[PDB]
Structure formats: C-alpha cells, structure tokens
Amino acid sequence: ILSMESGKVLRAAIRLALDVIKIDRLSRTPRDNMVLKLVLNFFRNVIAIEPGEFTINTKKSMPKKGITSIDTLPPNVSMDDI
C-alpha cells in the first residue's frame, strides 16, 4: 500500500472523501457518513498495522539450546519498509 505507485491509494481514498463532502450537509444521507467512516477506518488500518509477536508453547522445560531468534517478519519485508 505504501510503496505501490508512491501510495496513490491514499490519494484515491482522499478523492472519495472529496466526492462525499462536496454535497451539502443538510443533503447528506447516512450512506455518505458510512463512506466517511470507511475512509477513516482505512487510514486507521493503514497506520495501525505493525509486526506481530512471537508466541511459543511452554508444555515442557526450556531446552539448553534456547531461543535462537524472535524475528517475525515476512520474507521480503524489512523493518524500515513499514
């Protein structure tokens, strides 16, 4: 989302927001408010996404080998990208 075509998805969402707001306040229907809420939720989702957490089963004791790494990133994604 942040990389493809320099993130023009955000510009498209903004354009939808402009189309919604253009109509008058007293003429606004619930659907317009739904669309505005959808755009805001889209922005919140884009901002909020963050790397997960490393969960490990604890049925038995810690082996003497121990934890090697807790990296939880996809193959092609590095920290700086997100």
Binding site: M62, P63, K64, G66, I67, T68
Partner: protein, 280 residues
C-alpha cells in the same frame, strides 16, 4: 640450563635456554575477552576468560529480560591476542655421543610473535610449564604423561653520533686505503694488491634505479687463480667471515640446481614451494 637437564623438579620455575630455531607455526588467534549477545532483547555483554574457560552466563543479565540459555557468542567481536608455537633444537655442541638432538616446544605471545626466524640461534627465558594431554577428543579423560613446554617471556637473538664522529676521523687519514687493505686480512703477508681488490668488492659499486630500461647494479666479481700453495682459500674464508651473507660453496660439492633453487613441496601445507640455492 641444558635441554637434557630439565627434570620434574624444575616445573613452574623460570629457566634460561639456548638453542636453534627449527620451525615456527603461523600466527594463531588466542581469545582474551568473549562477547555475548542476547537473542531476545539484543543486549550485549563482555565476559572474561580464565584458564582457557569462558565464564558464560546462564541467563541474560538484564532484569526485565531473563530468558535462560538465550545468549549466543558473536565470534567476530571478541578481543583476541597473538599466539605462536616454535620448536627449539639444542645446539650441536651439547650432544653427548652423537645422537639425534632433542627438541623443546616454545610459546610466544603478543610482541614476541614473529621475532625469531627459522634457522637462528636464540637465548630464551621463560617458565617451564607442564600440561595434560587428553586421551581422546570426546572425553575429559587425560593421559598420565604430561607434555612439557616453555612459556617464553623474553627472546634475544644470539649508530651513535660518537661513532659517526669517530668514523669521519678515519676518512681524513691520508693512508686510508693501505689501512683498510692491511686490516681486512691481517695474517696474509705481502698481497696488498690482492687485498685491495678484495676490499673493493665488499663496498661494491653504486646502485641505479632506471626506468625506460633495466636496473644497473654495482656488483664486482673477482677471480683469484694462481699457484696452489699461495693464500687463496685463506682469503676466501677471511672474506666469508666479514660479509653479512654468503655461502661457502666448493667445486664438485655443488650442483646446478643446488646453486640456484630447488623445487620441492611443503608437507605441512601440502603446497608446491621452492627453496633458495647457494647463489640466491
């Protein structure tokens, strides 16, 4: 002390030895301070090494993170020192009844590394240490016989302005040529021209570095051919002593390859190497 007079009584005591260097291993990195990094919190700590043992931590030293057995050794961030192993052969004189001379191993660290070359006579002061040998790789079991070696702490390989002021005084002497020609070979009698010719070989010509061509070297070659009983070999030995480098090769005792260089193989490295002949 002699290499054949070291007894168990003299273990862990400072001794003095003299011998001939036979072979030295390349530089060996010896760990000094280890470096550990926690795999979870990426916390780094350095721990010391005592008696060849790493004082590893059981769990991360941080308070918030205490995951056990999560510490790993970063090999390339630990401090290291220099180690080298040398083999010393006792001087031929010490041999009692003409047998294979004994040898003693030496260890040198830090500055003394690469201080003695192969085929040199040195006097070394160090501690006569003893250490066990493990019977096999995969057990703590030890052999009852201990290996003996020496921990070297000192090695000695066996111009001032005043001298320059002194040397410049001789040059002013008018009869310098005769003085040097008479001092090069004191014993030989009435061979002043031969001595003079020999002397000019020691000094040598002048060196020239020359691009657009090749280097020109000022080296002089002299032939001494004459009647047998005259002092020819004596002068050869006399000059052989003075020069810093030289090989006393003879006739029918040297070979074409022996003079220039010999192609061989290094057993330790299993690579093709070449030795230096008499001329080289």
């Amino acid at each position: 002390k002699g290499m054949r007079e070291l007894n168990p009584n003299d273990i862990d005591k400072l001794i003095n030895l003299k011998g001939l260097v036979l072979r030295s291993t390349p530089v060996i990195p010896d760990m000094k301070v280890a470096f550990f990094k926690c795999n979870v919190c990426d916390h780094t700590m350095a721990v010391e090494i005592d008696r060849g043992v790493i004082q590893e931590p059981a769990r991360c030293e941080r308070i918030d993170c205490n995951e056990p057995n999560s510490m790993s050794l970063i090999h390339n961030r630990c401090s290291f020192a220099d180690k080298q192993v040398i083999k010393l052969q006792e001087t031929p004189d010490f041999v009692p009844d003409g047998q294979t001379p004994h040898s003693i191993s030496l260890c040198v660290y830090d500055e003394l590394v690469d201080s003695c070359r192969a085929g040199d006579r040195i006097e070394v002061t160090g501690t006569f240490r003893s250490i066990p040998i493990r019977a096999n790789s995969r057990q703590r079991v030890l052999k009852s016989l201990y290996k003996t070696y020496v921990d070297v702490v000192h090695v000695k390989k066996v111009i001032t302005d005043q001298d320059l002021a002194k040397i410049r005084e001789v040059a002013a002497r008018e009869d310098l040529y005769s003085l040097l020609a008479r001092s090069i070979a004191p014993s030989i009698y009435e061979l002043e021209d031969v001595k003079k010719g020999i002397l000019l070989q020691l000094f040598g010509g002048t060196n020239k570095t020359f691009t657009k061509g090749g280097r020109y070297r000022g080296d002089i070659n002299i032939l001494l051919c004459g009647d047998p009983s005259t002092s020819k070999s004596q002068i050869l030995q006399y000059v052989h002593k003075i020069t810093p480098r030289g090989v006393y090769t003879s006739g029918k005792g040297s070979s074409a390859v022996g003079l220039t260089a010999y192609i061989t193989r290094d057993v330790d490295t299993k690579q093709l190497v070449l030795e230096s002949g008499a001329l080289v």
